[PDB]
Amino acid sequence: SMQEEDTFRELRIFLRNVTHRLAIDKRFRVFTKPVDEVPDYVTVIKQPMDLSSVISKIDLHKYLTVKDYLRDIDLICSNALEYNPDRDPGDRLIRHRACALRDTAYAIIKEELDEDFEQLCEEIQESR
Numbered sequence: 001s002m003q004e005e006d007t008f009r010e011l012r013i014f015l016r017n018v019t020h021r022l023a024i025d026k027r028f029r030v031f032t033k034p035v036d037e038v039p040d041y042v043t044v045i046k047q048p049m050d051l052s053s054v055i056s057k058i059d060l061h062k063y064l065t066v067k068d069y070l071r072d073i074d075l076i077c078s079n080a081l082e083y084n085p086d087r088d089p090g091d092r093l094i095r096h097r098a099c100a101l102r103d104t105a106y107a108i109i110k111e112e113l114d115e116d117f118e119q120l121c122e123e124i125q126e127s128r
Helices: 002-023 026-031 051-059 066-083 089-112 115-127
Strands: none
Touching: 002 026, 002 051, 002 066, 002 089, 002 115, 026 089, 051 066, 066 089, 066 115
C-alpha cells in the first residue's frame, strides 16, 4: 500500500543518514570504497562489502529492515577481521577500526531508531 511504501522510504532515508555519518568519519575511510593494489583479496573474501556498496543497496531497495542493513555492516567488520588476523600494527589498526565501525552503527541505531518503527518494517516484510 501507500502506507507501506512510505514506511520503507523512511527506512531508506534513515539508513542513508547513518551510512553517511559513518562514511565521513576519518577512522572508517578504509571501508568507504571497494578494495589491483590487493591481488589476493578477490579470492580470500568471497563477499566483499563496503560503505559505497551499502549506499547502492539502499537505493536499489535491498534493505527492508534494519536487520538486513546491520547484516551488511557486520559483513564489512567480519571481512576486515578475517583478512587482517595478524598481530602486526597494520592488522590491529584495521581490526580496531572495523570493531569501531560495527559498534558505532549499532549505537546510532539503538539511540535513534524507534523499536516500533523497526517492528513495523519487519511485519510488512514478513507479509511479503
